[PDB]
Scaffold this active site. Structure first.
Site, short mmCIF file in Angstrom:
data_model
loop_
_atom_site.label_atom_id
_atom_site.label_comp_id
_atom_site.label_asym_id
_atom_site.label_seq_id
_atom_site.Cartn_x
_atom_site.Cartn_y
_atom_site.Cartn_z
N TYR A 93 42.72 83.94 35.70
CA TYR A 93 42.88 85.28 36.21
C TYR A 93 43.83 85.34 37.40
O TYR A 93 44.34 86.40 37.73
CB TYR A 93 41.52 85.89 36.54
CG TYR A 93 40.70 86.18 35.30
CD1 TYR A 93 41.12 87.13 34.37
CD2 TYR A 93 39.51 85.50 35.04
CE1 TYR A 93 40.37 87.40 33.22
CE2 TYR A 93 38.76 85.76 33.90
CZ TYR A 93 39.18 86.72 32.99
OH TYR A 93 38.42 87.01 31.89
N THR A 96 47.24 85.71 35.72
CA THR A 96 47.48 87.08 35.29
C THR A 96 47.79 88.00 36.46
O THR A 96 48.64 88.87 36.34
CB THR A 96 46.27 87.66 34.50
OG1 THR A 96 45.08 87.60 35.30
CG2 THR A 96 46.06 86.88 33.23
N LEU A 97 47.12 87.81 37.59
CA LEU A 97 47.35 88.67 38.74
C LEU A 97 48.74 88.45 39.30
O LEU A 97 49.43 89.40 39.66
CB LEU A 97 46.30 88.40 39.82
CG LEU A 97 46.42 89.25 41.09
CD1 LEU A 97 46.36 90.72 40.72
CD2 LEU A 97 45.29 88.86 42.05
N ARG A 304 41.20 94.54 50.23
CA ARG A 304 42.20 95.11 49.35
C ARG A 304 41.93 96.57 49.01
O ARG A 304 42.85 97.38 48.94
CB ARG A 304 42.26 94.27 48.07
CG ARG A 304 42.86 94.95 46.85
CD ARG A 304 43.04 93.98 45.69
NE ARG A 304 44.24 93.15 45.85
CZ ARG A 304 44.38 92.16 46.73
NH1 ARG A 304 43.39 91.85 47.56
NH2 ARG A 304 45.52 91.47 46.79
#
Ligand SMILES: [Mg+2]
Ligand SMILES: [Mg+2]
Ligand SMILES: [Mg+2]
Lengths: 354, 353
Positions: A93, A96-97, A304
């Protein structure tokens, strides 16, 4: 829609949390930190390797930040999977980020995708070259069916990023476009199927529940993220093509209406999520319930999403929602608020320089 | 149970009337030219020993499927080249031979990725054939479109896997029906295969192509769910259908499900025209031709036995049985073609030689 729909937000959120049954759990701050550092450490060592360092064009500061955001997401939502699993998924992941950092048109490198694939030659696009090389470490934790779902959703994701490179919210009247796109770069099936390690589950025995989980979880997971990251994305002129922003452009409706469409799907998703699974296999409903809770804790805790601001504002207001929210928030913080100095170290760069 | 012959008439009429079904593209001579070209190339392909050996299918059915597919392609991919129609016909015939099959993929899908990455032939014979042949289809497209075909085909393989469980979804699993329909719908394959690089520039028309794929995915599948809301009913292998799952998953009546589908179908059609009318002429053309041909094909093809309906209401003086038959006629005008004119010799005959 000049100011943020704080009222409406707090409400929808509280509802979401209640519908999903947000509440205390077995993960202990000690256990969270144990996993956070395990996953982080393995990943950090991985991305620090020269080959990875060489092919993955990313600003170190950002790679560092992304890796931390992902470890946290995984460790908090994939609560029942093994430590290795959290680690390996954390690496996947994080890849992908990181891809959303490339403007680099895929076209030229995707020209011989299939032929190279079939031949077994390393892909032209460095991302695929790294990801496909590493994939086995993630895929080993799953059975054939689940693995196929991860493979597909990741391929889907690669295309979704390609489409997004055009900063295109869809042609006005292209009602099908927004969800089409959201589903593409949503990694829904990846998430959904990665929740069922073959060490803890039998793909064949729980095929129907797993499939149903993937099917339903795909939308819940993405919509919960669209909603949660709607506060940070509100006054941000850089982020131009989000699900809500595309609903506006494609469906030709107000931002409020779009935000409305989202909440309804999100809430309805949540309801049916519990409804279908409550009476199902206990071990399943557990993974499912834990994913949702952790996934929301993570959103609430990770800076975030700047949700802490929504808290400090309605912190005192004596409304049911405001208070219902603030309570939930503190809930998360008690288990989710963890200084990175406790787990995320040393920095990837440091391991890379050595 | 009892088939909604009455309801079936109803909906069918509404759509056909809204989209304004009217196939006037292509001449019967041209149709036959392509039909036979595509059929001939495919038939020679499937007759090959290796294909004959690995593709477990009853010849009578392979023959039937191939014909159903050639027709579908030739009638909807009107603007693509002959080779294109042929190659696509081979690909979509592979997918169809699967669509109506039984066999647990699990054991053969255990080393899927490792074999893939290594470049070793897949364990599953279907993949072994399809992946080997894929390049012939993919050559007609650019990288973006090719990726869409590759993905949608992979999606499809999984969709068939899921269907092997004859599962209509858990009651209350609202997301399941469309999730599944989308999986074995080959929507993106169809949608992206409409834009050959010989006639289109993927980069120049990226936004239109993408939008086409996005929208076309649902139109294409829903139009088929509606049209085949006859041949899939009583059928065992096609028991779990989009409408039948809406019933099980959403816990609603078959009528409600059927009503839902038409709403989506009509709305899809509406926006399909709306978005594309004012766009690039060459695009709107391919799009318009696909839709028309795709509908012509449904009315005409055997596989959808919609014939056992023109003749079961060719007497019923309703308006649903006279709106249905007003079109069913208009269609077979250019779409009704005896197989003896194009589909020959039989695949088996070419294989035996
Ligand atoms: Mg199917
Ligand atoms: Mg059908
Ligand atoms: Mg079928």
């Amino acid at each position: 829609m000049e100011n943020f729909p704080t009222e409406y937000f707090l409400n929808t959120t509280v509802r979401l949390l209640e519908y999903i049954r947000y509440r205390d759990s077995n993960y202990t701050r000690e256990e969270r930190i144990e996993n956070l550092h395990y996953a982080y450490n393995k990943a950090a060592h991985h991305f620090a390797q020269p080959r990875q360092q060489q092919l993955l064009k990313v600003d170190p500061k950002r790679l560092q930040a992304s890796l931390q955001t992902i470890v946290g997401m995984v460790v908090y939502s994939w609560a029942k999977v093994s430590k290795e699993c959290m680690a390996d998924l954390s690496i996947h992941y994080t890849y992908t980020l990181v891809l959303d950092d490339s403007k680099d048109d895929p076209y030229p490198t995707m020209v011989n995708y299939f032929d190279d694939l079939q031949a077994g030659r390393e892909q032209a696009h460095p991302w695929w070259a790294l990801v496909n090389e590493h994939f086995p470490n993630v895929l080993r934790h799953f059975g054939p069916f689940c693995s196929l779902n991860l493979i597909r959703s990741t391929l889907d994701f690669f295309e979704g990023c390609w489409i997004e490179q055009y900063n295109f919210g869809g042609f006005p009247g292209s009602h099908d476009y927004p969800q089409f796109l959201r589903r593409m770069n949503g990694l829904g099936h990846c998430v959904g199927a990665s929740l069922w390690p073959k060490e803890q589950f039998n793909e064949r025995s729980l095929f129907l529940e797993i499939t149903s989980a993937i099917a339903q979880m795909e939308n819940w997971m993405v919509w919960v993220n669209d909603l949660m990251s709607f506060y940070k994305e509100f006054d941000d002129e850089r982020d131009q093509i989000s699900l809500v922003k595309n609903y506006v452009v494609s469906d030709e409706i107000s931002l409020h209406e779009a935000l409305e469409k989202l909440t309804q799907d999100t809430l309805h998703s949540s309801k049916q999520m519990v409804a279908v699974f409550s009476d199902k296999d206990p071990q399943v409903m557990d993974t499912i319930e834990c994913f949702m809770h952790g996934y929301v804790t993570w959103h609430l805790c990770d800076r975030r999403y700047r949700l802490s601001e929504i808290y400090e504002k309605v912190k005192e207001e004596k409304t049911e929602d405001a208070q219902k929210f603030c309570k939930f928030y503190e809930q998360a913080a008690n288990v989710g608020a963890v200084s990175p100095s406790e787990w995320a170290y040393p920095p990837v760069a440091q391991l890379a320089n050595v």
